[PDB]
Amino acid sequence: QPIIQFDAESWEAEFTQEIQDKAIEGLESGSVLFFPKLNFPLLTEELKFLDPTWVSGAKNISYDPRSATLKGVEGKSEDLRLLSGLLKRYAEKTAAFLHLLFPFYGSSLKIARTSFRPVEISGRATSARKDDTRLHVDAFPSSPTGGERILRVFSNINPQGKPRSWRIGEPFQNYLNHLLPQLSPPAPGKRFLLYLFGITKGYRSLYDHYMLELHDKGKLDLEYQKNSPQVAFDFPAGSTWIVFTDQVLHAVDKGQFLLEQTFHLKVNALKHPEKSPLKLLETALNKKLVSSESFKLA
Ligand SMILES: O=C(O)CCC(=O)C(=O)O
Ligand SMILES: [Cl-]
Ligand SMILES: [Cl-]
Ligand SMILES: [Cl-]
Ligand SMILES: [Co+2]
Known part of the structure; x- marks a missing residue:
């Protein structure tokens, strides 16, 4: 059950415990939770941001809700204020929705970066390791997790009705098993140097090392990319989906x-x-x- 469909249509949707149970069981089992009716509307004054030329550098536009900081875009302060407001509203609405849907997580949900991606996927071309048309779990060389989960909420806000074309791969345990013969320990001392030199934000744990190896080696395994079990799904314009992207194999095609x-x-x-x-x-x-894991005496 790679995709579980839900009826919720509002960021303030009321959920029964039965739907909450379906959501948490599906999320933790590695399904994508799909909300075809959950649109994220833009204000009239934000429609001008549906324009790829706002991207100023190599990265997509990003907002950190914790620090109220917008990056990856240049321009007049007023335009930056409006764009910050858009991404901040996305942060607030997704955070509220997750608290309505996942009370079991309580206050353990910690928000991280918001992303706005206005460039068409089908024209992108990157290095093999950065190429997200290749199935992967999320792992970022500069940003180790220390084991924490990467949970992502996505909304397709295309104004011309175009879907976002994903592929969803096989379960994490099967992906790990497939790539296990290719895994290798890190070179002694290398991760310490990456930390000392500021290449990584924090110290890359062994977990992060192996997640990066799965991500990278999986993307370079051309036979696995072509032949492994996977389903193609078009997320419609005006839909939202939720997924542990460190666990669910995913790729985007257009x-x-x-x-x-x-x-x-x-x-x-x-x-x-x-x-x-x-x-x-x-x-x-x-x-x-x-190594920074807590210890349970019993
Ligand atoms: O742009 C997308 O639709 C998905 C890209 C991706 O791999 C991700 O956000 O983790
Ligand atoms: Cl439902
Ligand atoms: Cl200005
Ligand atoms: Cl080391
Ligand atoms: Co990804």
Whole structure:
């Protein structure tokens, strides 16, 4: 059940506990939660941002709700204020929706960066490792997680009705098993140097090392990319979806105009921690993969 469809149409939707249970069980099992009727409307004064020329550099436009800081775009202060307001509203609406849908996580949901992506996917071309037309779980070389989950909310805001074309791959445990013969330990001392030199924000844990290896080696495995089990799904304009992108294999093939919000969640806040990439990797390699993990005496 790679995609679980929900009826909720509002960012303030009321959920029964039965729907909450369906959502958390599906999310933690590695399904995409799909809300075809959950549109994120833009204000008239924001429609001008549906324009790829707002991107000023190599990265997409980003907003940090914790610090109220907008990056990746240049321009007049007034335009930057409006664009910050758009991404801040996305941060607020997604955060409220997640608290309505996932009370089990309580206050453990920690918001991270908002992304606005106005460039058409089908014209993109990057290095193999950065090429998100290749199935991957999310792992970012400059930003180790220390084991925390990467939970993402996505909304297709295309104003011409164009879908966002994804592919969704096989379960994480099967992906890990497929790539296990290709995994290797880090070179001794290298991660410490990456930290000392400011290449990584924080220290890259062994977990983050292996997630990066899965991400990178999986993208370079051309036979796996072509032949592994996967479903193609078009997320319609005006829809929203929610997914642990560190667990669900995903790729994007085409589309334009997306809002995305990242949240972090500690593994011990999950309903079924044993389903997390951290615990699956720790079991598969029989070792502790994050030295900063808490210790449970019993
Ligand atoms: O742009 C998209 O639709 C998805 C890209 C992706 O791989 C991600 O956001 O993690
Ligand atoms: Cl539903
Ligand atoms: Cl100005
Ligand atoms: Cl090291
Ligand atoms: Co991704």
